[PDB]
Amino acid sequence: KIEEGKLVIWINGDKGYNGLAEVGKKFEKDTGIKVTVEHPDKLEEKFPQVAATGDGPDIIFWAHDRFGGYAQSGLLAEITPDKAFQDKLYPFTWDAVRYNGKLIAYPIAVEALSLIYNKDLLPNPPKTWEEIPALDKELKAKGKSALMFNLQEPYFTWPLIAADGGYAFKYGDIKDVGVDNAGAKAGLTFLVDLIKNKHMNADTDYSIAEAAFNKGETAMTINGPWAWSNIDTSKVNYGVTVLPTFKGQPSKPFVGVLSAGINAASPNKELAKEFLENYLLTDEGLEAVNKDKPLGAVALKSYEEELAKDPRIAATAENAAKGEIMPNIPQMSAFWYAVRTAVINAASGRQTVDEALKDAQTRITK
Numbered sequence: 001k002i003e004e005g006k007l008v009i010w011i012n013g014d015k016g017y018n019g020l021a022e023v024g025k026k027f028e029k030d031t032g033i034k035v036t037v038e039h040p041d042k043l044e045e046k047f048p049q050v051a052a053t054g055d056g057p058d059i060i061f062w063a064h065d066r067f068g069g070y071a072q073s074g075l076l077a078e079i080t081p082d083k084a085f086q087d088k089l090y091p092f093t094w095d096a097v098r099y100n101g102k103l104i105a106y107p108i109a110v111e112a113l114s115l116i117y118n119k120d121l122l123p124n125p126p127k128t129w130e131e132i133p134a135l136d137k138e139l140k141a142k143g144k145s146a147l148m149f150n151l152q153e154p155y156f157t158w159p160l161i162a163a164d165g166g167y168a169f170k171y172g173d174i175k176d177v178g179v180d181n182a183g184a185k186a187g188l189t190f191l192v193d194l195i196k197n198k199h200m201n202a203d204t205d206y207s208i209a210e211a212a213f214n215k216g217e218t219a220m221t222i223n224g225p226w227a228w229s230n231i232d233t234s235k236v237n238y239g240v241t242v243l244p245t246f247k248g249q250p251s252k253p254f255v256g257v258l259s260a261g262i263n264a265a266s267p268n269k270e271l272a273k274e275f276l277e278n279y280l281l282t283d284e285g286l287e288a289v290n291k292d293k294p295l296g297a298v299a300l301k302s303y304e305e306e307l308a309k310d311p312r313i314a315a316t317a318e319n320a321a322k323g324e325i326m327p328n329i330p331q332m333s334a335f336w337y338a339v340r341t342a343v344i345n346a347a348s349g350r351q352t353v354d355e356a357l358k359d360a361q362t363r364i365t366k
């Protein structure tokens, strides 16, 4: 079971878990309460597994879309922030972590994907998806490829799929699923054509794409704020801008609010509330993590009005506006699992675009 008199936190491997472990150090120095940060694999799936038996971390971090499912399963404790405290964050951030009338988590940062490009290789990144193939051809003269990004996680391909009309649950309505409509078919087909014509490889994942771009072999990649620090290290002269358009329509990334929830079975809920409100959700707490791995547009009114002036952050916000905040309903997990399978199947050749999205639609509704 969950150890008392201590705090165990789970945050994803691509986040600043050191910047966090640091915030924990202060907490410990100030309370004698040790704080352990971990980033297990598939934690979004492992958490509900162990929390269901009363185990798991005291605090779990993840985009808000997975929390509705957790709250539904009674795995999250209700959080008690002062009306004053919840006045420090934007009303839209709180709505993200609100399920059936209850606030089930603490909003941390707003995440949206952006087009990241190499300024030296491409002083002027493309505005449309359509011109990328030609650009890839011309970049051969420099021994480079045009674009590389994670094709294994639907989160990354969804912006293109939803550009021409694809959608999950229309503004949260589970009876309205659009993963297999015309827009979705157009988007995915473009991606598969890019692969068939050798402009991209279906096997490209997060690691390969990040190395390819950071090692300066590819002129562009698609990723969130957490990827910037590593690029900074690479010394690549990069820029962050708006995602390309498809069929004239802007890419629509699914926007996620990194959030921290408290395990319903935790005997340390008091220590967790303290840590999160007075040690993390401050202007300095977020900074400590932001410096490790950028968070993006934070939920904290005070800090976001500070940032947002950052070019990269402003671009993040721009893309977020053209996209959509993610549902938080329990059904989101089935949606992702279905689209994940469909994108990999269509991209690998296992299935045609039509068959892939059809099956995805079925996995979701039937």
Ligand SMILES: OC[C@H]1O[C@H](O[C@H]2[C@H](O)[C@@H](O)[C@@H](O)O[C@@H]2CO)[C@H](O)[C@@H](O)[C@@H]1O
Pocket (backbone or CB within 6 Å): 012, 014, 044, 063, 064, 065, 066, 111, 153, 154, 155, 156, 224, 256, 336
């Ligand atoms: O790909 C499906 C996946 O998308 C989102 O996960 C994001 C996460 O929100 C980001 O913070 C970052 O870590 O990249 C992840 C993609 O690998 C959804 O939040 C998640 O539920 C979904 O399974």
Ligand SMILES: [Zn+2]
Pocket (backbone or CB within 6 Å): 133, 134, 197, 199
């Ligand atoms: Zn071509």
